[PDB]
Amino acid sequence: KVWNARNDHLTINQWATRIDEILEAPDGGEVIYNVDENDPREYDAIFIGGGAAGRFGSAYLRAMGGRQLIVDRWPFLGGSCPHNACVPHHLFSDCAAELMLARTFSGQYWFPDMTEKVVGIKEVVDLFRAGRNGPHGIMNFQSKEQLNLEYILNCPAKVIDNHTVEAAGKVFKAKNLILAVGAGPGTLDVPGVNAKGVFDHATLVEELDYEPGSTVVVVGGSKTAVEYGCFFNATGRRTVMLVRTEPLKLIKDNETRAYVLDRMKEQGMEIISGSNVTRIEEDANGRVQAVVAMTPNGEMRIETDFVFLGLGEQPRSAELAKILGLDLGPKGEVLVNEYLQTSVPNVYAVGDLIGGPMEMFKARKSGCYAARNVMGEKISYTPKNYPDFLHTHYEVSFLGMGEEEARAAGHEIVTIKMPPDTENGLNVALPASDRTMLYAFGKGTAHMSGFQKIVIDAKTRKVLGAHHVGYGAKDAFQYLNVLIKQGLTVDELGDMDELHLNPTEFIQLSRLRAGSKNLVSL
Amino acid sequence: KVWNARNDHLTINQWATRIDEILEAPDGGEVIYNVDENDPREYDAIFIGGGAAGRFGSAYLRAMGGRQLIVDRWPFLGGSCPHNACVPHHLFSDCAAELMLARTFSGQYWFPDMTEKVVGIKEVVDLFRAGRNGPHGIMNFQSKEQLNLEYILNCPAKVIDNHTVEAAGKVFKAKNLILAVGAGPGTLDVPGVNAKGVFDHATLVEELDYEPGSTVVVVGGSKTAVEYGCFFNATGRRTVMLVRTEPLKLIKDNETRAYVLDRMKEQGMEIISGSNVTRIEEDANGRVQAVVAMTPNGEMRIETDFVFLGLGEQPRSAELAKILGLDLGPKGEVLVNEYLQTSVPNVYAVGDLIGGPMEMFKARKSGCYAARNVMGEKISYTPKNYPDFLHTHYEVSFLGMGEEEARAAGHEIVTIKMPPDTENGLNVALPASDRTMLYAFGKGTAHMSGFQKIVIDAKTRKVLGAHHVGYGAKDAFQYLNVLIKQGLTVDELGDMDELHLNPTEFIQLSRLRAGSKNLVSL
């Protein structure tokens, strides 16, 4: 049936419960119909998909005084992020970091004895499944009651043409379409890939009905592969990462990458470069029993009953491209100009549908910029020079140039880092800050307290790049990147007010060198 | 004896070991003499004290090409920070944060049963004592080998006059003195204050030779009292805080302060306002057995064998003031103009010695600006418009105006916060980020996932204040404050690249409102 929700006003937690019920419904659940049928204005845009791009684009268009409609096949707004992407990933990475701490200090202070202890993966996935309706509920509530958005949920949109969309058995006209249906999990064209026990980010939180055995094979080297792999390792499982190219290439600074990889290997992870799965072996019960892959050292066969695919996502372009005549790129991404316009008049495309980088900032901003163009503002969007981050068992944050990259680009450079390059190497009690204090003080753990570096042009004194391994700097890199894009010098960094003990020591270490006209690394 | 270390080059860990040896030596240890006997220049400045202010001032003065000498009675540089202040505080706050997590999820997932579990305060203090030599060693190493500093350590300075200081049985002349001896813990004029079992931050890490009983009394209601009190509570002890006025007045936003206090009370802390200790009772062996205090509801007696004094620190000005004739302020602080000059020609004063704000960003800056003035730069310093932070079992970060403060000042304001103002209140699954995911997803724990807010001028669209309770925002507030001092608007905030799931949600929540010319709270 169709639930006309326009004049109902559920709380956040009532929404959480209602969304849970609809997801539970054997028949698939009612359509959530939240349309202002008394507003006579034409729709400025209909958004196909209500994930990060469609939801933020709708919020911005409505804020500018335009009329929008979201259509989404899920009964909640927010798309993959709350249901199977950014949110669960963060729950698992929280677990990975806490578990590394517990295993390092096993049996000390309040920490349990972790020797032999295998943590239940299904237990944590079930926690996520039991709690994910909370964020769903906030999405539906905030969108309807605070952002004044119109939306039809739990209903696939049927695009008829570049001005016409069917939803909930009704036809809606709009001045523009904004295509925001995202991307689907990448898959592997090998025998056995459909065996029971092979999972991706989407299927893991829907179909995990058993506790994995002692070994996990992760396919891929993407952020998702590394984040999930470190969680699986932290639960106590032999974890083999089959990377197609080079592991963690995203970390351009060689010293930072080496520190991160070394810490992963110290936790027991096996990282295989240049590897390609050739077969997933099934046992007679139809479950994965082994993974066979070609590697630089020959064929490798790993016995396992649990495989996690962390491959690149694939834009959901096929049906829309057939209906509308959209020009597509080599990976199936919808091609757009710098105004987010597709090859089809009055059709924009945003978010993961337009390809990399597939990040939340890109999805939300492309949605908003498409909205501004729909509302008559000529505004271009090309994502460039952004900060980035990934989880291992640490938070890893980076922006700008790595040290070698900056030298190769012609810059005379100095660096300011922690710990310093000395005979004792990493085995010193800095850097140290919130959630690295036990590492900094424990017996033999000082090398685990983190790593960080800024790359500086020796003559202009400008900061060219920043790199951090530890905890609590990720949020800072958002604002620091803005400052660096403005032309931040080592002197200006030293002039700031630090909040000691700080995750990034850049401010005070810069101050220690900024008094000299001829800069020297620290 | 006097160890001429000038031409010795110890590693960091060799320094750590040597400092331990000197500290434990019954005779008091050798003097550490690191003076350049070939330099014919007069010292531009002698720094009395080698804490944050003296060490950073020396580093900056040397970097500008001047000559400096540090004299400190400790055998290490860095002052209180590594020995008994910021560093141990952060170790304690880390355990409190980890212990709140463990108690909340006691007996779930990998967490042991925290019922019946009292964590050893002495074990954690002993961990700090065993590891504090690491930072000591880095301080001495970095100062000598990387910063090119001269210093005499493990030797009290005798200031003879405004150009003359004796140290290690030698007389040194200087163009200027920079007084950097810091501040010492305040005391309580009540019977029993010397009883065994009364500690402050300094004596706690030197004299704790027993494991405290089940109750702790903390005297005071600002940063140090609150940070240590939450640690004591997290170890499983009934913790009663006796606050003279009202607690956490530094948190100006009323909702933020209420969230912080509410979460402390939910952990079991008892916060008694308007209370004054009357007596600390000693048993027949000279050990604390109870605290008697007057409260607005009359006298109360609390049985305890452990009292922690978290009173404001007192500038160490008496001896120097009498020697030099320094003008002092009402709190014993040394009075300085905006160039850090005392009333005595060629004598500057810096750090905690000059009073509030007693922070690591103040002492460092003050000492650096004093150095620059000594070297011929007329540069003023008045600490103002800076971010601030404290620990409870959370990290608490704040800058600028609270909401009520801004409205009382005539500003038309909007606020953008998380969680929203609704019937469900805090009992919703946002805000959520690293180290709050378990709270956001746990049964009955969502209200523990944090609280955050920005205060915005509705007409200029400028951010007037920002407030956050959670984890991983402290470092960001350093750089966010700089942007706000430049004139940050909600539109510019919305234009940034966020790194989802971010500790501060200010970027994307701003984006949700910035599309309207008439701003609306969220």
Ligand SMILES: Cc1cc2c(cc1C)N(C[C@H](O)[C@H](O)[C@H](O)COP(=O)(O)OP(=O)(O)OC[C@H]1O[C@@H](n3cnc4c(N)ncnc43)[C@H](O)[C@@H]1O)c1[nH]c(=O)[nH]c(=O)c1N2
């Ligand atoms: C495992 C994992 C982990 C992360 C991330 C991804 C993944 C897979 N990401 C990336 C992030 O999730 C991604 O960039 C955005 O969610 C994409 O938002 P979109 O709205 O463009 O797509 P998204 O796919 O979210 O939106 C599509 C929406 O449209 C709906 N839809 C599809 N077809 C439809 C149809 N025919 N009719 C109606 N509705 C339809 C879908 O149901 C969905 O609601 C991330 N990013 C980041 O910044 N930080 C991070 O930590 C992570 N972590």
Ligand SMILES: Cc1cc2c(cc1C)N(C[C@H](O)[C@H](O)[C@H](O)COP(=O)(O)OP(=O)(O)OC[C@H]1O[C@@H](n3cnc4c(N)ncnc43)[C@H](O)[C@@H]1O)c1[nH]c(=O)[nH]c(=O)c1N2
């Ligand atoms: C418990 C606790 C916790 C914190 C903090 C304080 C306390 C008590 N602080 C405050 C911070 O510690 C403080 O602002 C600085 O350490 C002050 O540095 P100074 O160099 O000014 O004094 P400090 O006292 O550190 O330096 C004095 C030095 O001079 C020496 N000296 C003294 N008299 C001498 C004499 N006659 N002859 C020779 N040498 C002499 C001393 O031995 C010492 O080495 C803080 N700040 C912050 O930013 N973040 C935080 O988290 C905390 N946390």
Ligand SMILES: O=S(=O)(O)CCS
């Ligand atoms: O970007 S959205 O707020 O829509 C989803 C956050 S998980």
Ligand SMILES: O=S(=O)(O)CCS
């Ligand atoms: O500020 S100092 O570098 O001197 C001490 C930091 S622990």
Ligand SMILES: [Mg+2]
């Ligand atoms: Mg280290």
Ligand SMILES: [Mg+2]
């Ligand atoms: Mg909450």
